[PDB]
Structure 1
Amino acid sequence: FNAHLVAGLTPIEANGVLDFFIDRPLGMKGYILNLTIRGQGVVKNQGREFVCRPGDILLFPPGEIHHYGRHPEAREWYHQWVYFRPRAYWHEWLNWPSIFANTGFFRPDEAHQPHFSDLFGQIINAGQGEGRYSELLAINLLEQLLLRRMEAIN
């Protein structure tokens, strides 16, 4: 199984078996990009909270605190994630402005939201494909997403 990029969808339903905030103080070894597709969510970090709506991409550097879950007034919090080990030269494009601590955040303007959510959607599919070149495609597409953000931020 993959040793570079993994992805998937976590559909949180109210009172479902997955309806609960996840918490890992020691973060993780790899990075994580989070995109909220259905409903709302909320991240936490030492008392501080942030609500993520549809079309929001959150970045979680290695070791960063992971504490988020569905928003109590949201019927659900569906989000797509991508766990990865970036390429050496990718770091410059991973310096996102953090809502707090070192948790990057990016909210595409109303006009770019469609493209980004879609590219991200392709990354998820590539990441879950069985094809021998599936992972390399997801990696490539992830890189495109990053690169697109850099130019999108002008």
Structure 2
Amino acid sequence: NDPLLPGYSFNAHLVAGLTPIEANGYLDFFIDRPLGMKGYILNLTIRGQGVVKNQGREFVCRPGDILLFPPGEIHHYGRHPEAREWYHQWVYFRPRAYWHEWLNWPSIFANTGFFRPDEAHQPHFSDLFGQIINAGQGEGRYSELLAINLLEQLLLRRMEAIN
């Protein structure tokens, strides 16, 4: 099934994609998983604006913003009501054991993290995020491993950036 719509199982394998939300279109609905997921999600906004909701709180994500949703965290977000669209790339994954230090991002609220590269590094992170999606969507024997690897690269580039 389409991972962008209900009925798709996210569990142990990495899954990546682009959710091109456009007002009034087929994807114009909120992600609403109050019990969270069985793995992590990294979300990069590439167009428009999204609104991330969590127990009454709202945070507007804009192009270049990267959000981190650890397992069990509430997933409640969708296109900002005042924006015509919210295109966001995302990657669902289970981390390698040693990735945890790099998964500690400052929370906008609850345990939903946020990282935004500075303008100089925006293109590189966006490019890298796209590579993750391309790899994650491959069917090759090493596709998932490559996606995992690229995601590790992103986490490390962030570690470099914040430092």
After TM superposition, the score normalised by the length of structure 2 is 0.91
After TM superposition, the score normalised by the length of structure 1 is 0.96
Q: Which shows bigger deviation, 20-29 or 44-53?
A: 20-29
Q: CA RMSD in A?
A: 1.3
- Residues 32 and 84 of structure 1 are in contact (CA less than 8 Å); yes or no, is this contact kept in structure 2? yes
User: Where in structure 1 are there 5+ consecutive unaligned residues?
Assistant: none
SS in 1 for 2:15: strand
CA distance in 2, matches of 1:52, 1:150: 21
Q: What do residues 93-148 of structure 1 show as CA deviations (whole Å, max 9, x unaligned)?
A: 00000000000100111111110011000000000012211111111010000011
- Residues 57 and 105 of structure 1 are in contact (CA less than 8 Å); yes or no, is this contact kept in structure 2? yes
- Other-structure match for 1:124: 133
Q: Percent identity?
A: 99
SS in 2 for 1:19: coil
SS in 1 for 2:149: helix
SS in 2 for 1:93: helix
Distance 1:63 1:15, change over 3 A: same
- Other-structure match for 1:43: 52
CA distance in 1, matches of 2:67, 2:135: 20
Distance 1:105 1:2, change over 3 A: closer
Q: What do residues 1-52 of structure 1 show as CA deviations (whole Å, max 9, x unaligned)?
A: 9943110111111101211122111001110000111111110001110000
CA distance in 2, matches of 1:2, 1:75: 31
Q: What do residues 48-81 of structure 1 show as CA deviations (whole Å, max 9, x unaligned)?
A: 1000000111000000000000011111101111
- Residues 2 and 135 of structure 1 are in contact (CA less than 8 Å); yes or no, is this contact kept in structure 2? no
Q: Which shows bigger deviation, 69-78 or 1-10?
A: 1-10
SS in 2 for 1:119: helix
- Residues 6 and 127 of structure 1 are in contact (CA less than 8 Å); yes or no, is this contact kept in structure 2? yes
- Residues 40 and 77 of structure 1 are in contact (CA less than 8 Å); yes or no, is this contact kept in structure 2? yes
Q: Which shows bigger deviation, 90-99 or 2-11?
A: 2-11
- Residues 17 and 137 of structure 2 are in contact (CA less than 8 Å); yes or no, is this contact kept in structure 1? yes
